[PDB]
A and B are shown apart, each in its own frame.
With several copies, the nearest count.
Chain A
């Protein structure tokens, strides 16, 4: 499964980062979602780093040996959401527990 830091707070004007740690390797493609409370998760990062059209340019991803990372170039109060990562493991779609960012 995917590990999580638990939170980022009062991150304003700075970068923000989330990491998921797995025996799952950065080799597993790691995708990322932004779930504003009350909303369905929104895909923000796919194929490890790429961003979809429609979200801020602020978003991009990266990875280490076994860890996927989400990066926001400038943090805003308006970015508050529960952020998640997902893994296509053996036909089992698993999620991390979510990171609370504001």
Chain B
């Protein structure tokens, strides 16, 4: 279950490999809009933190989850800053979320005295004052519990369909990035002149099996003039000598 709005589950993704393109390429989402980044170039980036904000809204509200939009959700529930960078992913969840009679676990904030700040969250049920006497603590004239708590029905228009929304934001907080897209690789072919890239080490030469042994620890070896002599392959931990191409 996804949470309602006025209620955000922020996953906090760190220390992992993000196969972003799986989400993009698997066309199971109705909406997959990326701001500031191509959805397919996201794989070449790495962040200190990635946040996934999980919530449920109605179909005609999907368009409000955007840096430039306004409305009941954009302003009182989940506001994105105008400089938002990240991806908004959403899909039709009618199959899980609609109930006959209405699946009333879904809350929306119909009341606030001001717009909500970007990424601000306010989860109080405080009875709202519309005027006159505060009337605090009870509903009444000029006192309104803030959230409607609508339900979803099996019979609906596409707009009343529940949608599950996950918003991915990305940041670099003056720290080593830890959420990286996957590395790609090629097959390893020996006894040919090849332009190599092993981990972060590059150069052209010919690899052959080596008779060297490294402590479990070392990854690369060098000669007396600091030239890489051999490398350990990252997948098969064998040591391969590098000769110059003639």
Contact = CB atoms under 8 A, between A and B. Distances in A.
Interface of A: 23-25, 27-28, 65, 90-91
Interface in B182-197: none
B interface, size bucket: under 10
Contacts of B71: 91
Is chain A's interface secondary structure helix, strand, loop, or mixed overall? loop
18 contacts: A23-B157, A24-B157, A25-B153, A25-B155, A25-B156, A25-B157, A25-B160, A27-B153, A27-B155, A27-B156, A27-B157, A27-B160, A28-B160, A65-B155, A90-B60, A90-B159, A91-B71, A91-B72
Contacts of B160: 25, 27-28
Q: Which of A23, A25, A28 has the most CB of B within 10 A?
A: A25
Nearest to A91: B71
Interface string B138-166: 00000000000000010111011000000
Contacts of B60: 90
A90 to B, nearest CB: 5
A77 to B, nearest CB: 32
Contacts of B153: 25, 27
Nearest to A90: B60
Interface in B163-188: none
Contacts of A28: 160
Nearest to B60: A90
Contacts of A25: 153, 155-157, 160
Nearest to A88: B72
Contacts of A91: 71-72
A88 to B, nearest CB: 9
A64 to B, nearest CB: 11
A51 to B, nearest CB: 16
Q: Which of A23, A27, A90, A91 has the most CB of B within 10 A?
A: A27
Contacts of B159: 90
Interface string B57-79: 00010000000000110000000
